[PDB]
Amino acid sequence: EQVCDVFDIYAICACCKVESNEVFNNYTFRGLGNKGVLPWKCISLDMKYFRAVTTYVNESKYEKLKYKRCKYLNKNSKKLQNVVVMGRTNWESIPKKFKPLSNRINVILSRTLKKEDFDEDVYIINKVEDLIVLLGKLNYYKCFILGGSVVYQEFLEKKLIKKIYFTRINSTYECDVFFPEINENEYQIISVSDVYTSNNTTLDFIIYKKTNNDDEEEDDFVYFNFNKEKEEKNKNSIHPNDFQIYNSLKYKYHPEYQYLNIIYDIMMNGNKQSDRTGVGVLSKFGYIMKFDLSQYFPLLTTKKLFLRGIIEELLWFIRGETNGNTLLNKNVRIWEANGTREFLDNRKLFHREVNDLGPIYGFQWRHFGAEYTNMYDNYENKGVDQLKNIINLIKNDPTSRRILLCAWNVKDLDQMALPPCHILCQFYVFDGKLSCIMYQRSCDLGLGVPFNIASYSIFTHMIAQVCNLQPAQFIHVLGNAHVYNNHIDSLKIQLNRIPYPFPTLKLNPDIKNIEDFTISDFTIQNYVHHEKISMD
Amino acid sequence: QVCDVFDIYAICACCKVEEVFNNYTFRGLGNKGVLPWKCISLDMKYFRAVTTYVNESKYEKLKYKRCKYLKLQNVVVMGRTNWESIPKKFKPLSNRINVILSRTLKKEDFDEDVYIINKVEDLIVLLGKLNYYKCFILGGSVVYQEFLEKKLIKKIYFTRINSTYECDVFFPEINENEYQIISVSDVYTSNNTTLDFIIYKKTNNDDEEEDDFVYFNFNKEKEEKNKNSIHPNDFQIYNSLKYKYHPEYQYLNIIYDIMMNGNKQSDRTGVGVLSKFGYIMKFDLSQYFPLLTTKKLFLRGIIEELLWFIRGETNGNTLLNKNVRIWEANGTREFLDNRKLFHREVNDLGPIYGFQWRHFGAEYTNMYDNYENKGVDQLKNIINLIKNDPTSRRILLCAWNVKDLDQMALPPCHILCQFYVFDGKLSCIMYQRSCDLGLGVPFNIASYSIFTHMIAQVCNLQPAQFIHVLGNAHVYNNHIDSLKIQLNRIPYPFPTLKLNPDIKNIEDFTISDFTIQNYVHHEKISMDM
């Protein structure tokens, strides 16, 4: 029966990255303070969250806490409040006008200072066993260790912390004090929040837990689930013990899990099929993922992704290009296999030159309906410039339900190296904000989708910028959602990884026409990721 | 009160008997001493799970409230006829404290180690003795009748058998103001009939990982910031349902979402809408036909529109001479002139659905030209892919021809279909760019559900899921009062579609090959004024 379960002693902290190819682990976020204050100016969303955790109380759950604490000890007002506990330097960093922390029982550890050194209404204690004494004598909901790196150190080495409410600030600052390295045998992460932007930085909230190493309408649920097939004669021959970490998290709110949960769904429930190659897949039909581009760039973190190649693909599209050599000469090999003599001949394109990919995305975006000749032709003022038209509808008719860019030209399919997977983009504008749906007919979950999420997220930012709009939601509709069999083992590794706060994307702000972007106009700041996974 | 105190529940299954609909549609209980239907086996299964199930760590709180009033099994209570109607092999219903109502036959008469009672009241005492989880009235018309009169029923566990059967005995009209529905299950096919499971209730006139939930909601919308200017009050029946598992809730929940969180915008026509972006509804065509039951929908017009598309027509008059007027407004001199189609004959709708489906890339001329073997017959093609190459990820039927949008009376709402085949079953996704949730979507669901069945049948496949992906989803501001009325109606179990099984060419359907079966619906709603 451990002290920290009876007295409900939690730690809450926020850690940035410090000035240290780069390896990343959970020690990456470890920077606590600098010269006796915080390393960052304001991160107001961290304060709002801090406020919410340290001030939240539930009177109904108090009676069971009181009984519990009175039991363990062999045994005023009633306006229930939490206790907070501060190193003295912690306490001397707090602006005067906020002391003591409102609606919280403030406790400060000091040797140099005694109660007569304070005006405030704070409990002063010499020592830790003095907090345990006080907590046995107070009516309080929960006790939060607000730190000082010294306070954090002594509280974990005494195994007095039940959980750590740990905030990952996904930027770097100068630090002189650090949070101790959390022992993974002693603490495991059980919950990871959504990812937000506050004060020009992304952040998320994770919870580490100390490791053990009317209720009529409760029953209606079980009646109503009477037909359910899964007794667990595993539909698909993937095992539980393999996703031990994935399955052990309670709150999986990081948006990366929108993509990770579909791979779980395809693996646990997919239909076994033998696609065009013979490879074999598990497949499902119909999914939506939504990413909040105002809060992050959804580059997956559970594996390393490089975006030079897909950014140069998006610029190639926008220029209207179909010349596979242009990508090959920038050492981008995305379309190399689809432009071989063999691949083209096998597509019955016997009169198509090597790397002439025919009327693919770029052609359809700038010239839909023009007769395709060859990758070198001047197609100016031929066919519909869809791209130009959709920028025009966003600018001048934002409320239009007809702002779509369509790659799927039915007449041209057989003349393309292969029919496009990104069928269409629709756009939606409300209150100065651009959202985008892309519908993908065919979705390689292990290899393709992660880049696809990136391409269309970058594209949405570009259309938003050139239209004087802010980006909102990139919405990804997956039709035929498949995991290739020989990706499965890699995907089992990736799923047992815990996402890191997303990075951000900065477009050079001077670019104002969609045509005027170059590779140097794109910056991915603060990409924290697990190491690369070769999907085979 | 007795019933809340003693956990006295009725379980029944009521078919329709041999025009306007209400809950008392579903009354048929029995016929000639047996049930009115041969064997509906999803219901027999439900009836087990419900009447066996008991919770270990909860009878503590009923040892409480029943004896604070004055392995553990369940009590069941059946009349003699209800007891005799049972075959011999299942008596006394296994794992259950069997019991009977009988003024006549006693325990020395009857077979195994049941219980008997002779007064309705005499039950009260027997329960006051026994150790039991919950008490179920399996009934007979007569047993049910006198238990509802005497106000002894906490909850009714009522199966809606959605077919018609000869009946001699019935269930009591369920007293509308004395009971209300608190839960409604998924819809199911079983033994060639749809059925759902609703729950009537009596009206009255490791919990740390729970606080973590509140912390993670720290940045949510509060009450002033649950955006919009509709009320809680007005959707009280919608809001009172705990379990909303009937698939119509996929449509209703989107209306609720748009009303409550929708962005106020002022579209094209100066009209006003609440708008969201990106939804996905999925309907199990193998289990029901998703024709909205919270109001009356008619399908002849949208079935004719579908046949019209399949024939490749663009001629608005063909529809107008069958009094299908879906496209009338889009064919007027005025509407064509405002689309800058000054040189388009009235009701010449241009290269719309039909033309793209059967002639994609052909130069449109007029609605009367012969276009045989011109452009890409996507419809013939997607059918040949399903039959020759079902694992293809290229089975798309696309109406959004970018070359032709300006020539169209208007661009299509229904951008494309994509098909999926697994294990001789056909699913269809339709991506809808523009979604009027009040008028359009209800019809749009039916159109593409029917289409899926048509494509499945000419391909010798069983239809599986219709998946409706909404892009710009909007409620017209002046549909709001109508939809509020609609949200507070409990869906009925869906109907079924019978296609004439002889039709094996998509081109060979006629209006008489389409039959809707057992359509039970709440009344017509004018969506406007």
Ligand SMILES: NC(=O)C1=CN([C@@H]2O[C@H](COP(=O)(O)OP(=O)(O)OC[C@H]3O[C@@H](n4cnc5c(N)ncnc54)[C@H](OP(=O)(O)O)[C@@H]3O)[C@@H](O)[C@H]2O)C=CC1
């Ligand atoms: N990023 C974050 O989440 C947080 C960052 N911070 C930052 O942390 C830094 C301050 O931390 P750090 O320098 O360790 O200092 P601390 O806040 O941990 O202050 C340590 C002081 O607390 C007293 N103390 C600690 N333990 C005891 C004990 N057991 N008994 C008696 N006194 C005790 C001593 O006071 P005395 O010296 O008078 O005897 C000690 O000098 C600042 O930069 C602050 O802004 C603070 C909290 C959270």
Ligand SMILES: NC(=O)C1=CN([C@@H]2O[C@H](COP(=O)(O)OP(=O)(O)OC[C@H]3O[C@@H](n4cnc5c(N)ncnc54)[C@H](OP(=O)(O)O)[C@@H]3O)[C@@H](O)[C@H]2O)C=CC1
């Ligand atoms: N749809 C459904 O879910 C169900 C349908 N059924 C159907 O219902 C039909 C038969 O039931 P219904 O006509 O009621 O017959 P019941 O099964 O209810 O049996 C009636 C008998 O129960 C006894 N009884 C009733 N009230 C009292 C009382 N107040 N005090 C003492 N005894 C009482 C009498 O038996 P006695 O003769 O001993 O005096 C009465 O004749 C059949 O078709 C059966 O299959 C049955 C169950 C479920």
Ligand SMILES: CC1(C)N=C(N)N=C(N)N1OCCCN(Cc1ccccc1)c1ccc(Cl)cc1
């Ligand atoms: C605030 C912070 C960094 N965030 C999390 N998640 N966990 C913590 N332990 N941190 O809190 C430090 C507590 C002291 N603090 C630090 C502070 C804030 C601003 C400027 C200097 C110091 C503070 C100041 C004012 C109020 Cl109202 C509440 C807490």
Ligand SMILES: CC1(C)N=C(N)N=C(N)N1OCCCN(Cc1ccccc1)c1ccc(Cl)cc1
């Ligand atoms: C069974 C039925 C119709 N279904 C629901 N949902 N609710 C009821 N109250 N009904 O229960 C009647 C009990 C008699 N019966 C039904 C029956 C069976 C065959 C012929 C006539 C009646 C029966 C037989 C075997 C078992 Cl395991 C359980 C119930």
Ligand SMILES: O=c1ccn([C@H]2C[C@H](O)[C@@H](COP(=O)(O)O)O2)c(=O)[nH]1
């Ligand atoms: O941007 C792309 C391009 C291709 N694919 C995958 C999907 C399929 O695995 C394959 C395309 O093959 P078909 O679906 O065209 O047969 O490539 C993607 O996931 N994303």
Ligand SMILES: O=c1ccn([C@H]2C[C@H](O)[C@@H](COP(=O)(O)O)O2)c(=O)[nH]1
């Ligand atoms: O099959 C259809 C056709 C139209 N609409 C609705 C969507 C809009 O309310 C309007 C179409 O006008 P635009 O979206 O093209 O502006 O009609 C539908 O919901 N379904």
